[PDB]
Design a protein around this ligand. Structure first.
Ligand SMILES: Cn1nccc1Nc1nccc(-c2ccn([C@H](CO)c3ccc(Cl)c(F)c3)c(=O)c2)n1
Length: 336
């Protein structure tokens, strides 16, 4: 027969995985669904081709190590990994995962959510995030397309390529745009607030077309930052820009979302706080009155131990990273 092919991309995952169907693609990979002839279900398969770039190698290794370590209902797992039998021949890595029927990006393009579903999705996002943060990990790229949903409204967070151990513009915290890397766990909470806003209105709350436009969108709702807000390490260009702007008035949340649950808007206000030091943390968010019908501290697992990378990944040449990826994936090879 041959390896199957999808949109030009070779998908060399047979014979176990067949009947491929395109799901989507990114800068250095493609995601398809496939039929698994061992477990007799359809699965997701992400083809990644990262080896020409140190950055892409980092992401690939980080996602693999983190997802194989993590164990939580609201976090996607890895069931299988396919790659070449020799490192010389390995140009692609195929990561096999439970197939989810859709993502929140797609869902919000087509469906108006009930307040009860918004509440339940938010709960699951934060429940998963509680586990991530308890492992001392930052996800750093939370957004609707990284929130997977199955047929019965189960939610799983995916794509941990940008994850980092502590110590997409539209969903990026202010600190990110103010700092050349100077931020914390709170950046994830900002992203979740953006996602909550988007679930309330079916449109991105801060859809900036570029960096400056993103800052202007944020201040367009929060208003000009205070002195306290600007009492931090900030990029000089960004600080000067902000100081050059006209005054902007704060827009009350109930004016932007006139039909939203008042409790939902109270939580939204605490997540979309400019100053990350005054921004609500994940446990406090779970305990917020908006989530009272789902909050269950007896059933919200945390990680057994903090997550730790054994090597300074940023320092490693991409060739060493490829060797680590070969090693991490060896356990899925026959005869291991
Ligand atoms: C049917 N459908 N529609 C949307 C999602 C799904 N189902 C599904 N099921 C399991 C896993 C995944 C899935 C998707 C996207 N991603 C990231 C999203 O950022 C991703 C990284 C790299 C590249 Cl190249 C990519 F295209 C997507 C995952 O990691 C994992 N999706």
């Amino acid at each position: 027969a041959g390896p199957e092919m999808v949109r030009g991309q070779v998908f060399d995952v047979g014979p176990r995985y067949t009947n491929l169907s395109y799901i989507g693609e990114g800068a250095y990979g493609m995601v398809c669904s496939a039929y698994d002839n061992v477990n007799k279900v359809r699965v997701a398969i992400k083809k990644i081709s990262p080896f020409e770039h140190q950055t892409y190698c980092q992401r690939t290794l980080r996602e693999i190590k983190i997802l194989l370590r993590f164990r939580h209902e609201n976090i996607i797992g890895i069931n299988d990994i396919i790659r070449a039998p020799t490192i010389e021949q390995m140009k692609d890595v195929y990561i096999v995962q439970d197939l989810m029927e859709t993502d929140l990006y797609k869902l919000l393009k087509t469906q108006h959510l009930s307040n009860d579903h918004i509440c339940y999705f938010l709960y699951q996002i934060l429940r998963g995030l509680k586990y991530i943060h308890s492992a001392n990990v930052l996800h750093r790229d939370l957004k609707p397309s990284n929130l997977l949903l199955n047929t019965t409204c189960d939610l799983k967070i995916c794509d941990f390529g940008l994850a980092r151990v502590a110590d997409t513009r539209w969903y990026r915290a202010p600190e990110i745009m103010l700092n050349s890397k100077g931020y914390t766990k709170s950046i994830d909470i900002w992203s979740v607030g953006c996602i909550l806003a988007e679930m309330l209105s079916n449109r991105p709350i801060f859809p900036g077309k570029h960096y400056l436009d993103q800052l202007n969108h944020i201040l367009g709702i929060l208003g000009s930052p205070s002195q306290e807000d600007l009492n931090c390490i900030i990029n000089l260009k960004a600080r000067n820009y902000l100081l050059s702007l006209p005054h902007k008035n704060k827009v009350p949340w109930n004016r932007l979302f006139p039909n939203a649950d008042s409790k939902a808007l109270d939580l939204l206000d605490k997540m979309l706080t400019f100053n990350p030091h005054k921004r609500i943390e994940v446990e406090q968010a779970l305990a917020h009155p908006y989530l009272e019908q789902y909050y269950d501290p007896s059933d919200e697992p945390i990680a057994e131990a903090p997550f730790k990378f054994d090597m300074e990944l940023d320092d490693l040449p991409k060739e060493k990273l490829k060797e680590l990826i070969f090693e991490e994936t060896a356990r899925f090879q026959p005869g291991y």
